[PDB]
Write a protein that binds this ligand. Sequence first.
Ligand SMILES: *[C@@H]1O[C@H](CO)[C@@H](O)[C@H](O)[C@H]1NC(C)=O
Ligand SMILES: *[C@@H]1O[C@H](CO)[C@@H](O)[C@H](O)[C@H]1NC(C)=O
Ligand SMILES: *[C@@H]1O[C@H](CO)[C@@H](O)[C@H](O)[C@H]1NC(C)=O
Ligand SMILES: *[C@@H]1O[C@H](CO)[C@@H](O)[C@H](O)[C@H]1NC(C)=O
Ligand SMILES: [Cu+2]
Length: 150
Amino acid sequence: HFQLQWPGARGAFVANDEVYFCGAHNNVTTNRTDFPLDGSGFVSIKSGHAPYTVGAIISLETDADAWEDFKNSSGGDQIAIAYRQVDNSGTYCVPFNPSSLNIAGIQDGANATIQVVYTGGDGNLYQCADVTFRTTVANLNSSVCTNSTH
Ligand SMILES: *[C@@H]1O[C@H](CO)[C@@H](O)[C@H](O)[C@H]1NC(C)=O
Ligand SMILES: *[C@@H]1O[C@H](CO)[C@@H](O)[C@H](O)[C@H]1NC(C)=O
Ligand SMILES: *[C@@H]1O[C@H](CO)[C@@H](O)[C@H](O)[C@H]1NC(C)=O
Ligand SMILES: *[C@@H]1O[C@H](CO)[C@@H](O)[C@H](O)[C@H]1NC(C)=O
Ligand SMILES: [Cu+2]
């Protein structure tokens, strides 16, 4: 199982609810995190076990409350973060530059939902972060952006 460190999840982490869409927080929230476009962006999670595979899909819908909001115009998932296998438990953090994606809608002031997709042997698990993309974000704390190793 995993928890978003940053940007923060829509709602409280409930382990048994991670099998549901957006961790059973299906409705979009208004308390969005500001997320920088200038390349200082990241996504940090915490996993209780390894190995696991993890990636992320994205919606540019303000009201992201269904799977279909995370599909592109050809009907596949809008992959914001490529799937990869992670071999260490604890913290795992990937740089994320929304600018790099091949999607109209990604600009300063734009709303999005990042849904992390995880499989570590105990289900297909999900958590969602509601963000607003900004040109820059000052005082963006990066301490949580480490990779634990053994
Ligand atoms: C947004 O507010 C909800 C409801 O109180 C809370 O559960 C969640 O942690 C908040 N999200 C962030 C990113 O602060
Ligand atoms: C972005 O989301 C906020 C809620 O936090 C909302 O007030 C605003 O209208 C949204 N932007 C658009 C263009 O829908
Ligand atoms: C939609 O996303 C899928 C990956 O899930 C990809 O095969 C397809 O090229 C994408 N469509 C685009 C980029 O318009
Ligand atoms: C964590 O590992 C991934 C590759 O698995 C890498 O992209 C990322 O930069 C690493 N994070 C840090 C903070 O080193
Ligand atoms: Cu688990």
